[PDB]
């Protein structure tokens, strides 16, 4: 029985409380079919100062549908939890030593706290040195979320290249975004500005953009284009860098990998991923 680890990230993974009775609210998709919901245990409260608690919650979204398809196809049982530190996963020196460890879903996978990461997880070489990825289940990139009426030319935008406190930008801590900017020597000035303003989660950075507390949020286009398309006040701008995929994550040399990739290939071939897009990504006008 596989331990699935995932992370709150609309529209791939919604996270909601159970009802009083421990069930999940009965909901239907835009097409009228039941919304599939799985119990995921994890931290409910992340707001600093208040106690944390690991409780049963309700999970659904692109990635949860994808999990259910994988489980049925490949005939496995699972249980799902949210990553305890709330993070995607970067490699960082621990305990003020020279020893390095992965945080986030990365670290949980490596430690055996999870067996499979099922999430909008960016594929790259840094992470590929430690784990294995499926073939992409979704192709995407980096863009920028801003308030309507802002446009950014791209990575050479002066507001990015020559920063001031008049235009604040950030991303999420312990994401591959933060590391890419950390490592690229040509992006040092951007990194140094951002390290001061990064957020613990996407949700928080997004709220900051809406509340005019952050001017620009650098993040996954698959997420941000969904967010911008459902919030009339917010738009995307810029296509930074290169294109990138989301993959299932598994430990090196895992017996799962081949059949997971095969299952994702089928879903690219047969219209299932497109059906998921018509359910979770593009289906109505902005109303938030």
For ligand A1ILT, the binding residues (CB under 6 A) are 88, 120-122, 140-142, 175-177, 180, 220, 241-242, 244
Pick the closest to residue 9 from 66, 69, 53 (CA basis).
Answer: 66
120 is in an annotated binding site: yes
275 is in an annotated binding site: no
CB of 234 to ligand A1ILT, least distance (A): 18
CB of 120 to ligand A1ILT, least distance (A): 5
Q: Which is nearer to ligand A1ILT, 58 or 63 (CB)?
A: 63
* Residue 264: HSE in the Cβ half-sphere, 13 Å Cα cutoff: 21
Q: Which is nearer to ligand A1ILT, 24 or 276 (CB)?
A: 276
CB of 86 to ligand A1ILT, least distance (A): 12
157 is in an annotated binding site: no
Tokens describing residue 187: 């992006």
Tokens describing residue 279: 């359910």
51 is in an annotated binding site: no
Q: Which is nearer to ligand A1ILT, 56 or 141 (CB)?
A: 141
DSSP string for 88-99:
---EEE-TTSS-
Pick the closest to residue 234 from 214, 250, 255, 256 (CA basis).
Answer: 214
Confirm if 118 and 138 have CB atoms less than 8 A apart. Answer: no
Confirm if 58 and 52 have CB atoms less than 8 A apart. Answer: no
220 is in an annotated binding site: yes
CB of 122 to ligand A1ILT, least distance (A): 3
> What is the separation, in whole angstroms, between the first and last Cα of the chain?
38
Which residues sit in the known binding site for glycine?
A: 120, 122, 127, 176, 220
């Amino acid at each position: 029985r596989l331990k699935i680890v995932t992370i709150h990230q609309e529209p791939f993974v919604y996270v909601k409380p159970t009802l009083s009775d421990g069930t999940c609210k009965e909901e239907f998709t835009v097409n009228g079919d039941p919304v599939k919901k799985v119990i995921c245990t994890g931290p409910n409260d992340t707001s600093p100062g208040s106690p944390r608690h690991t409780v049963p919650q309700c999970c659904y979204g692109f990635c949860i549908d994808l999990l259910i398809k994988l489980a049925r196809t490949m005939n496995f049982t699972y249980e799902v939890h949210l990553v305890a530190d709330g993070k995607f996963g970067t490699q960082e020196r621990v305990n003020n030593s020279n020893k390095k460890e992965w945080n986030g879903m990365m670290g949980e996978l490596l430690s055996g706290q999870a067996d499979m990461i099922v999430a909008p997880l960016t594929i790259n070489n840094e992470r590929a040195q430690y784990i294995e990825f499926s073939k992409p289940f979704k192709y995407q990139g980096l863009t920028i979320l801003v308030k309507k009426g802002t446009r950014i030319t791209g990575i050479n935008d002066p507001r990015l290249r020559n920063p001031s406190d008049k235009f604040i930008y950030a991303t999420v801590k312990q994401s591959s975004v933060d590391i890419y900017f950390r490592r690229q020597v040509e992006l040092s000035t951007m990194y140094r500005h951002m390290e001061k303003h990064n957020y613990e989660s996407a949700a928080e950075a997004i709220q900051a953009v809406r509340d005019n507390k952050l001017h620009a949020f650098i993040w996954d286009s698959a997420v941000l284009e969904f967010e911008a398309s459902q919030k009339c006040d917010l738009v995307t701008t810029g296509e930074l860098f290169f294109r990138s995929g989301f993959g299932i994550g598994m430990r090196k040399d895992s017996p799962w990998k081949q059949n997971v990739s095969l299952s994702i290939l089928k879903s690219h071939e047969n219209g299932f991923m497109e059906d998921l897009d018509k359910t979770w990504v593009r289906y109505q006008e902005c109303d938030s």
